[PDB]
């Protein structure tokens, strides 16, 4: 059957644009202000929101996101606060997926977390330190609770692993990272029709537009955190510029 995120990408493709995919960590700079920021993203034209779960040992986040997740953990952020963020985003007419390191999901219970996320209106899970090789429980929870499953590929991924990682993904494949980003997207396009989101330290309209030529979704995270730290108005302005960037004409 159709993936949960299928209609958003179908719709974006029909209007000659990429989907704008926006990341914010739950609890930064505190729980209420982060919910207000995530709502703002919905109101300012984010097609998909990645609700980040702060983690004590976030090996793959750059310093902007890492400082923000640290502040969130100092403020007492909980995993259930990410489920609340998903609820508020759904209520505001948005579409939320969660991005998390795997151990918090194991600690919660994989089946339980998929169930509760689905209940809150969550559409999927982005798993930056879960590879399909270790995802058996997650694949079963994902099919049971109709949640998409977004694995990452990298420019270094072998032919064999890229194909297995694409085949295991539903919703979109995250092409994490220069011609590396278009070359990696083109390798996913050679084996499958799944939408490909591209993260590339995007911080301007110009860069989102560049990526929207070849990718189905433009992923922005660091620049949204930086904008939010300055203030909610700055976040709105930036998200606006990025929303204009993803549309091609």
């Amino acid at each position: 059957e159709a993936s949960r995120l299928g209609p958003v990408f179908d719709s974006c493709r029909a209007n000659n644009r990429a989907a704008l995919i926006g990341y914010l960590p739950t609890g930064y700079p505190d729980v209420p202000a982060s919910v207000a920021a995530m709502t703002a993203l919905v109101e300012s034209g984010c097609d998909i929101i990645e609700v980040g779960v702060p983690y004590s040992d976030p090996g793959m986040d750059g310093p902007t996101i890492a400082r923000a997740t640290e502040a969130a953990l100092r403020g007492g952020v909980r995993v259930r606060d990410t489920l609340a963020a998903v609820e508020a985003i759904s209520i505001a007419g948005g579409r939320a997926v969660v991005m998390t390191y795997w151990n918090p999901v194991l600690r919660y219970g994989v089946d339980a977390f998929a169930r509760d996320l689905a209940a809150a209106g969550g559409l999927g899970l982005i798993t930056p330190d879960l590879i399909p090789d270790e995802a058996q429980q997650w694949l079963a929870a994902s099919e049971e609770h109709r949640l998409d499953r977004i694995f990452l590929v990298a420019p270094s991924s072998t032919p064999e692993r890229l194909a297995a990682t694409v085949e295991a993904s539903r919703g979109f494949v995250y092409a994490a990272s220069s011609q590396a980003a278009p070359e990696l997207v083109g390798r996913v396009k050679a084996v499958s029709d799944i939408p490909v989101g591209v993260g590339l330290g995007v911080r301007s309209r110009a860069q989102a537009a560049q990526i929207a030529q070849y990718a189905d979704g433009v992923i922005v995270g660091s620049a949204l955190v930086t904008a939010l730290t300055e203030g909610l108005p700055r976040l709105r302005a930036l998200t606006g510029e990025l929303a204009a960037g993803v549309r091609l004409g």
């Binding site: 890492a66 795997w102 918090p104 600690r107 990452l152 270094s156 991924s157």
Partner: protein, 399 residues
């Protein structure tokens, strides 16, 4: 092969302990190290190269010394010390490092990185890279640079760049996080010389295979000096390299008790400890499914110990498996128990152990009381205490 994990690195079944809880961005280089190790572990020319450096450069075998003057504190049991403290660089770490540095050269890698807590793994790596002409970068928590400064100075004399890590607890776990970051950004040219029996496959198995020599030698030596297999073999347990090293040769000796001793810091009831098996629970951490100190949400609880080497909230997956199976017991030893033992060994036998190693000595003394007169206990004396002399001198009011 018998105690090995499956090709995905799992102990105890296809979804048990170990595995590879890593990002896809690290899988190309992890597969490359796995293939390289699978090839070289059965090459006699590789094992010759390793054996030759073990003998002539590192001075193996390490001796087994019967520490007769400890006996009265150990219930009149007989404590035998496996003297890894006499290895080049002053710990068991050099065994693993020699294997991996040989492997990195076989792979055509020009740059080596490593994490370190006590600085013994960092010194060993720096040492091997100097010997083999490899560039070396060592990551160390800023709290550890301050309390193991002798080892920082050594690494630098050996030509290594030492990077002080200021994130999180500024101890071993945070050095590891930084090392993995370096590796994903520098995979083309860089080998990660992982320092303990933990991490994603292949590291738990490879580290252990390079530390097996300790228990192989000890099993022969204790039969020679005591006339029988021991009643117990014991070790301290950080991530688990020295313990798995000495334990492995005895796993199929069903009369031989195996006991691992973990750092309990101020005590397990204080929240300032690293007693991963005593107070932790299963989870995914630093590339393996194993035990770790974690809160209700799955956030890592920061470890504390007087020992920089045992100050780690996780443990290797093979130990998790051996725990679950009932083959090894894991027990807490506090800072104070460790320091009493440290002092006792200095005064009684004239051996200054590493503070890590003194946790094992403390545990053996207790085990001795439990087992009684004449019991034969082999203790891995993982390292010497030169790095800890200032800390120990302060503890004992000697300046």
């Amino acid at each position: 092969t018998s105690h090995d994990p499956d090709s995905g690195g799992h102990f105890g079944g296809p979804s048990g302990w170990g595995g590879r809880y890593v990002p896809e961005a690290l899988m190309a280089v992890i597969e490359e190290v796995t293939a390289a190790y699978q090839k070289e572990r059965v090459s006699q020319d590789f094992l010759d190269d390793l054996d030759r450096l073990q003998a002539n450069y590192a001075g193996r075998p390490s001796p087994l010394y019967e520490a007769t003057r400890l006996s009265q504190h150990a219930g009149s049991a007989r404590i035998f010390l496996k003297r890894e403290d006499l290895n080049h660089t002053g710990s068991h770490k050099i065994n693993n490092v020699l294997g991996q540095a040989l492997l990195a050269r076989r792979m055509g890698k020009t740059r080596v990185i490593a994490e370190t807590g006590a600085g013994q793994h960092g010194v060993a790596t720096a040492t091997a890279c100097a010997l083999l002409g490899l560039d070396c970068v060592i990551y160390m928590g800023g709290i550890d640079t301050a309390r193991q400064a002798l080892n920082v100075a050594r690494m630098r004399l050996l030509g290594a760049e030492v990077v002080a890590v200021q994130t999180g607890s500024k101890t071993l776990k945070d050095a590891i996080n930084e090392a993995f970051r370096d590796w994903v950004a520098n995979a083309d040219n860089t080998y990660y010389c992982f320092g303990t029996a933990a991490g994603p496959h292949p590291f738990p198995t490879m580290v252990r295979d390079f530390q097996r020599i300790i228990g192989m030698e000890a099993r022969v030596q204790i039969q020679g000096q005591a006339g029988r297999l021991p009643d117990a073999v014991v070790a301290c347990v950080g991530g688990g390299s020295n313990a798995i090293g000495i334990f492995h040769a005895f796993l199929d000796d069903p009369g031989v008790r195996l006991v691992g001793f973990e750092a309990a810091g101020d005590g397990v009831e204080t929240g300032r400890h690293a007693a991963t098996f005593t107070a932790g629970s299963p989870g995914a951490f630093h590339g393996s499914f194993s035990y770790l100190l974690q809160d209700e949400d799955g956030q890592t609880i920061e470890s504390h110990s007087i020992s920089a080497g045992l100050d780690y909230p996780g443990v290797g997956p093979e130990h998790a498996w051996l725990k679950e199976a009932g083959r090894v017991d894991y027990r807490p030893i506090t800072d104070s128990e460790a320091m009493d033992a440290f002092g006792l060994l200095c005064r009684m036998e004239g051996i200054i152990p590493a503070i890590e190693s003194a946790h094992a000595v403390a545990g053996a003394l207790k085990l001795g009381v439990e087992l009684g007169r004449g019991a034969v206990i082999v203790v891995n004396l993982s390292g010497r205490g030169d790095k800890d002399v200032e800390t120990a001198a302060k503890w004992f009011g000697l300046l």
